[PDB]
Amino acid sequence: EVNDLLDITQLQVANALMQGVTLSSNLNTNLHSDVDNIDFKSLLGCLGSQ
């Protein structure tokens, strides 16, 4: 029961992180890691397809 509480806790955390987020399919984070002198190279890692 404790481990199932942990499992549904992790799934609530993951659904809070992942509800309502569309994405660009052509998002290449090694090409896109900056917007207006703000450094998103260290913030968000690799993403895309390749």
Added chain:
Amino acid sequence: LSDITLIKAGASRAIEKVNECVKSQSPRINFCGNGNHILSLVQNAPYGLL
């Protein structure tokens, strides 16, 4: 005695849901439901609420 704490947490969550979703209309975001939320109703389910 440990499970009454989870029932009291669910009681406080349904009290705040009764107050700000059903019994009034809250300007808060991502609390009732999941986001993209409209309103709520209530119904005495066994040993809880629905």
